[PDB]
């Protein structure tokens, strides 16, 4: 029950594009949301291809938290996963 997030080329201060590997024996990923530092909304990531993306009209403020829903109905919340100053091509694990 493991997740890594690698920042993909194409991310910028208003846009994160993430390759997310989600291992959970017998289940698999259905949904992912980001929550910015000190913010109360969960913002869905949209699956584009085999990566996930979320855009903002303002720069995103981190560190960023993430919530997952598996196709099995299992939900996890991981806090402080990725710093504001992320780097493209770096992998991050909660």
């Amino acid at each position: 029950v493991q997740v890594t997030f690698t920042v993909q080329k194409g991310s910028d201060p208003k846009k994160l594009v993430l390759d997310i590997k989600y291992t959970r024996p017998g289940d698999s990923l259905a949904e992912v949301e980001l929550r910015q530092h000190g913010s109360e909304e969960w913002e869905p990531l949209t699956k584009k291809g085999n990566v996930w993306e979320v855009k903002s009209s303002k720069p995103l403020v981190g560190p960023f938290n993430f919530r997952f829903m598996s196709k099995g109905g299992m939900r996890n919340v991981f806090d402080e996963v990725i710093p504001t100053a992320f780097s493209i091509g770096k992998t991050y694990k909660p």
Side-chain angles (χ1 to χ4, degrees), residues 10 25 29 39 44:
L29 188 47
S39 152

Side-chain angles (χ1 to χ4, degrees), residues 6-24:
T6 310
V7 179
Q8 301 296 97
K9 289 222 101 302
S11 304
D12 59 60
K14 293 223 259 24
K15 188 158 92 131
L16 271 172
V17 184
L18 302 161
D19 173 10
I20 302 185
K21 308 285 60 208
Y22 181 95
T23 306
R24 189 180 171 101

Side-chain angles (χ1 to χ4, degrees), residues 1-86:
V1 10
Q2 288 296 268
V3 311
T4 67
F5 302 79
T6 310
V7 179
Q8 301 296 97
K9 289 222 101 302
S11 304
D12 59 60
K14 293 223 259 24
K15 188 158 92 131
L16 271 172
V17 184
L18 302 161
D19 173 10
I20 302 185
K21 308 285 60 208
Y22 181 95
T23 306
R24 189 180 171 101
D27 209 356
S28 62
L29 188 47
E31 280 173 0
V32 186
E33 281 128 44
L34 177 137
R35 176 170 77 79
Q36 297 181 59
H37 188 69
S39 152
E40 64 272 62
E41 295 85 357
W42 290 102
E43 308 181 42
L45 280 66
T46 297
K47 167 153 235 187
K48 300 256 155 87
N50 76 307
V51 305
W52 296 79
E53 151 204 323
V54 57
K55 70 199 255 151
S56 189
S57 95
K58 285 310 155 112
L60 295 155
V61 177
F64 305 111
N65 316 290
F66 295 91
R67 165 166 82 186
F68 284 81
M69 182 59 81
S70 67
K71 310 196 281 145
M74 305 299 220
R75 189 65 126 175
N76 297 93
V77 181
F78 298 108
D79 289 77
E80 309 292 281
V81 177
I82 304 170
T84 301
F86 43 93

